[PDB]
Every structure is written in structure tokens, then in C-alpha cells.
A paper describes a structure:
Aurora A is a serine/threonine protein kinase that plays an important role in controlling early stages of mitosis, including centrosome maturation and separation, mitotic entry, and bipolar spindle formation. Localization and enzymatic activity of Aurora A are regulated by its interaction with the spindle assembly factor [name]. We have used fragment-based, structure-guided lead discovery to develop small molecule inhibitors of the Aurora A-[name] protein–protein interaction (PPI). The initial fragment hits identified from screening with the ATP site blocked by a high-affinity inhibitor were very weakly active, but guided by continuous crystallographic analysis of the inhibitors in complex with Aurora A, we were able to increase target affinity by more than 10,000-fold, clearly demonstrating the ability of fragment-based and structural biology approaches to develop potent PPI inhibitors when a suitable binding pocket is present. These compounds occupy a hydrophobic pocket on the surface of Aurora A, discrete from its ATP-binding catalytic site, which forms the interaction surface for a linear N-terminal segment of the interacting peptide from [name].
Through a further iterative development of the inhibitors utilizing the crystal structure-guided drug design and biophysics (FP and ITC), we improved the affinity of our weak, millimolar fragments by over 10,000-fold to generate the lead compound [name]. In addition, the meta-channel between Tyr199 and His201 could be further exploited by the replacement of nitrile with heteroaryl ether, to give compounds 9, 10, and the lead compound [name]. [name] engages with the Tyr pocket through hydrophobic interactions at the bottom of the pocket and with polar interactions further outside. The indole NH hydrogen bonds with the Glu170 side chain, and the acyl sulfonamide stacks against His201 and Lys166. The pyridine ring in the meta position pushes Tyr199 sideways, creating a channel between His201 and Tyr199 and forming a T-stacked aromatic interaction with the latter. Finally, Arg179 latches on to the central aromatic ring, with [name] bound to a well-defined pocket which is partly induced by the binding of the inhibitor. An overlay of the crystal structures of early hit 2 with [name] bound to Aurora A reveals a remarkable overlap of the core biaryl scaffold in the two compounds. [name] displaces [name] from Aurora A with a KD of 19 nM and a ligand efficiency of 0.33. Our lead compound, [name], inhibits Aurora A:[name] interaction, binding Aurora A with 19 nM affinity. [name] exhibits oral bioavailability, causes pharmacodynamic biomarker modulation, and arrests the growth of tumor xenografts.
Author numbering: 127 to 388
Write the structure that this text describes.
């Protein structure tokens, strides 16, 4: 049982859809953590209060060094608070802005961590569905940590999400409003692997219009510097038909992953 009086609030770590994430310290233990704050009014208007308990319940029951931890949760008159593990090295998103693109070693490494964390999520039939650089956080040793379980659900699901932010990571099945499996996360893995190497996602467009078309048609191209091995893994992953998409063990054992991964 927790309350806001139990914490000292620091600076904002980042901005959320329904609030903001703050750096904080628990007074009793001196424990540093991140407090994800969600406004009740905003959540009510979206009718997503049910999905919040779902994000809460799913994340709370996951233990993995490559998965952001959820210590607890509490609420008051106006807000719902999520006591998260603090990731000191920020988002993968911020890293990509800095470096423009990652090398094959860095990419394969992040992909390995994603795949481990993902395979483990899928073992509980848990699908993330919001895999993207802003939701991939970095630990003290620079280890990839999956976060933002806001749109997570148990597999299979037919649930429709509050439209995009960027439609860029969603598979055609989710976009078409069709039923989806753990395959959604595999598609996202292909999008992420491409973005890390190229600096931008494979179906990126100026409009939601063009993006939907491109995702639907699976219409993307590789720049010349992309290695043949990277092309194979990405190509294997971006299958329109979910069944075609490989398992995580195949991904984890891919020669390119094994050659440049750590
Ligand atoms: C209006 C309201 C309440 C609320 O007032 N609850 S209560 O006081 O009346 N009533 C006793 C459950 C509660 C929530 C809510 C929705 C989801 C979560 Cl996870 C939440 O946080 C916790 C944490 C620990 C135990 C239970 N819930 C709170 C939301 C989300 C949007 N509007 C809300
Ligand atoms: N544990 C954390 N450590 C560090 N930064 C965090 C942490 N959790 C969130 N952030 C920052 O706050 C942003 C929003 O948090 P997130 O859980 O992804 O919210 P939302 O569901 O609103 O998108 C993140 O993308 C990141 O920039
Ligand atoms: O944690 C949140 O801000 C939200 C809870 C309700 C579902 C959507 C979710 C999100 O945008 O990640
Ligand atoms: Mg997010
Ligand atoms: Mg979210």
C-alpha cells in the first residue's frame, strides 16, 4: 500500500499519452525509481481504464533483466501512479537521434535482448503490441529494457488501439482491425531492426495515408549499405502473412545475429 507522500519527486523523465513520467526517490529506503503518472479524467474520456489495469497486471507479473520492472501502483483523487524501475540511460529513441544509425554489432545486440524479452513475453501468451524506440529503455550497463505495457494484451486478441502516434510499427493484421497473435511482435522486430540500421522505419511517410498503403502492400526498400545478412533477417520478419514470420529461436539463431550480436 503506497501513497504520493512516500516519494520525493525529481525532474520529468519523459512525457506520456495520459500524463508524465517523473524521476523519484522513495524517502524510507532512498530508492530511485520512475513514477509514471496518469490523470484519471483523461483516462476516463478515452475509456481505457480497463486497459490500464491490464498494463498494470501484465507488467507486474513479468521478471526479466530485459523487461522494465513494475514494483507497484497506487491512486488518488486525480491520478493513477505506476512505480517503475528507473532506466538511467534513457530511451533507444534518444540514442538513435544522436547516432543517426547503429552499426550491425549494436543493432544485433539490441535485437538479441528484444528477442529474449519477447520470447519470454510470448511464453505467457503476452503480446506487447507497442514495440518502438520511445518504449525501449536503457539500463546502467546499457542493456535494452522493454517498457510501455499500456497496449499489452493476452494472445489471441481482437482489441483496437487508440490510433497510432506513428502507425509505423503496426502489422497489417492490427491495422486492418483483424485478430492478431504473438506474430505482431515479430513484425515490430523487423521494423525495429530496419530502423536501427537505416535511421528511419521501413514504411515511414508524411501521412498516415501513404504509411497504411505501404504497410498493407509490404512496400519498402533497402539502401545500398544494408548488408545481405541484415536484408535476409528483415525480409524474413516483414511477412504480410503472420504464419510466414519466423519464431524467436530462428531470429536468435540467425547467422547475422550470431555474427554481429554479443
Ligand atoms: C475514477 C477512477 C478510479 C477511482 O475513482 N477508483 S476508486 O477509488 O473509486 N475505487 C476504490 C476503485 C480508479 C481508476 C484506476 C484505474 C486503474 C488503476 Cl490500475 C488504478 O489504480 C489502482 C491502484 C491500486 C488499486 C486499484 N487501482 C485506478 C481510474 C482510471 C480512470 N479513472 C479512474
Ligand atoms: N522507467 C523509466 N526510466 C526512464 N525514463 C522513462 C521510464 N519510463 C518512462 N520513461 C520516459 O517517459 C516516456 C513515457 O513513458 P511511457 O511508459 O512510454 O508512457 P506512455 O504509455 O504514456 O507512452 C518514455 O518513452 C521515456 O522517455
Ligand atoms: O499507460 C498509459 O498511458 C495508457 C493506459 C491505457 C491504455 C493506453 C496506455 C498507453 O498509452 O500506453
Ligand atoms: Mg511510450
Ligand atoms: Mg503507451
Amino acid at each position: 500500500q503506497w501513497a504520493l507522500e512516500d516519494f520525493e519527486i525529481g525532474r520529468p523523465l519523459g512525457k506520456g499519452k495520459f500524463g508524465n513520467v517523473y524521476l523519484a526517490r522513495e524517502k524510507q529506503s532512498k530508492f530511485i525509481l520512475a513514477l509514471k503518472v496518469l490523470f484519471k479524467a483523461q483516462l476516463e474520456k478515452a475509456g481505457v481504464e480497463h486497459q490500464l489495469r491490464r498494463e498494470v497486471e501484465i507488467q507486474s507479473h513479468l521478471r526479466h533483466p530485459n523487461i522494465l520492472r513494475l514494483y507497484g501502483y497506487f491512486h488518488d483523487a486525480t491520478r493513477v501512479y505506476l512505480i517503475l524501475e528507473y532506466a538511467p540511460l534513457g530511451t533507444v529513441y534518444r540514442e538513435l537521434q544522436k547516432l543517426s544509425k547503429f552499426d550491425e554489432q549494436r543493432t544485433a545486440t539490441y535485437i538479441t535482448e528484444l528477442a529474449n524479452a519477447l520470447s519470454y513475453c510470448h511464453s505467457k501468451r503476452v503480446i506487447h503490441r507497442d514495440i518502438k524506440p520511445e518504449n525501449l529503455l536503457l539500463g546502467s550497463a546499457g542493456e535494452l529494457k522493454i517498457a510501455d505495457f499500456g497496449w499489452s494484451v493476452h494472445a489471441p486478441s481482437s482489441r483496437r488501439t487508440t490510433l497510432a502516434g506513428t502507425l509505423d510499427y503496426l502489422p497489417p493484421e492490427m491495422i486492418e482491425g483483424r485478430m492478431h497473435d504473438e506474430k505482431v511482435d515479430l513484425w515490430s522486430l523487423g521494423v525495429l531492426c530496419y530502423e536501427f540500421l537505416v535511421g528511419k522505419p521501413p514504411f515511414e511517410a508524411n501521412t498516415y495515408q501513404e504509411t497504411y498503403k505501404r504497410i498493407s502492400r509490404v512496400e519498402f526498400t533497402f539502401p545500398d549499405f544494408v548488408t545481405e545478412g541484415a536484408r535476409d533477417l528483415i525480409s524474413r520478419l516483414l511477412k504480410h502473412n503472420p504464419s510466414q514470420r519466423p519464431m524467436l529461436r530462428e531470429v536468435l539463431e540467425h547467422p547475422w545475429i550470431t555474427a554481429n550480436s554479443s
